[PDB]
Symmetry: D2
Amino acid sequence: RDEAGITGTWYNQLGSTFIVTAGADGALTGTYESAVGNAESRYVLTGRYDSAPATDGSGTALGWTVAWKNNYRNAHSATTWSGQYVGGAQARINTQWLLTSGTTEANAWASTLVGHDTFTKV
Amino acid sequence: RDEAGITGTWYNQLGSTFIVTAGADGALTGTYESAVGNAESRYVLTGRYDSAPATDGSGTALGWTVAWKNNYRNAHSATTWSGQYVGGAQARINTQWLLTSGTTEANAWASTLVGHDTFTKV
Amino acid sequence: RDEAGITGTWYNQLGSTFIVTAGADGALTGTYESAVGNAESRYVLTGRYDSAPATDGSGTALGWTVAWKNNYRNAHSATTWSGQYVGGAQARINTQWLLTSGTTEANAWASTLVGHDTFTKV
Amino acid sequence: RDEAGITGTWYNQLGSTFIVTAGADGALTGTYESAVGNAESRYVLTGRYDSAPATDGSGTALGWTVAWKNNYRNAHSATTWSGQYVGGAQARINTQWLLTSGTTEANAWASTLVGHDTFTKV
């Protein structure tokens, strides 16, 4: 498994900081601090990962969610990242994400941003 | 808040079953059973929701993750749903999702499915 | 082929109107009028479709683009729809879309909306 | 406008080749050759771009479609790229894409890949 490879502090191309602990069972728990958007300080995250990945050089599937409410701000929105962990000297988490805002029904067509983040250990 | 509105059993257009408990703090915990794909029985889910939504008729942002490993099967993949809860007589969770498979680096361009699920209480 | 099935006037769940002509070669040409957003009147569209689909009951893959500039307005943005045509008594075009705005580099993480539209002939 | 900046040969991170001509009106026409997937040689593309972008340093919105049928192969699928052109010494087209396959109704939940391509002139 990749419990030890995933656990730790990761940084994306925006300068955001993802701090995660991987459990033996498949759990991801930690904190996220965004460098951009309607965000300040750390937010709770939770998610899941494949604790028994293929042994054929494939990556390890995982995902997590942040709801953008903490003691400081409430951005009435949530992001989910879906992606894979790729181990080795330049380990990476390669993700795509969906950021949904709470909207009225009239604006719901415009509720959801999509993007991609790559996380490294440096 | 929508802790009471979200907590419970939901069903999507595929006939899948999402069983969730919403915590007062923003946590989502439960199980997912897919009617389709490389899946059997229930899988753990975790996620987050906005526990203090806007009071202007907007929906409530939330998201969750399933890693597709349980005691029966391992599909080496994870889905994340990002969406909003809309309360009332015909409550709904309207989502978009990202399903990432673990892949080799050569196949990583094709790692991620996108789609949309609408969940109802009936 | 589905040249005759695709050609014509389609309407989505938002009340927008998609008017398309399918060419024998795979071309899609027409106009789009959005019921929502920073849009008024008709905009040019172009796209492509599979002119020789599988004969196994599969749908017919297609896509198209609108840039949201016409004589009336310029929303500095473009949407692409990717989807499939499914023929028969209740024909449908089932799509997902990506709406990209021109942004500064600082805001580029938030450039792109994602959603889904279903088009019918009625 | 960016007619002159967009027109030409572009290459993505996969080694695919996008050859486009931008018209004064907003048209994109050209050919695409994928380095990956069920593809060989060149395929027709068409699309649109914002011919009068904001003058505030924002990028220029555009999109295009390929249906994956040519004289050599038919992959019964279409990709749409949605993105923005950013000019200057290291010009780039930054995109996200949706690749839809024709599917049966039973498999339609799994019809659509999502990803991201960055195109450069070198």
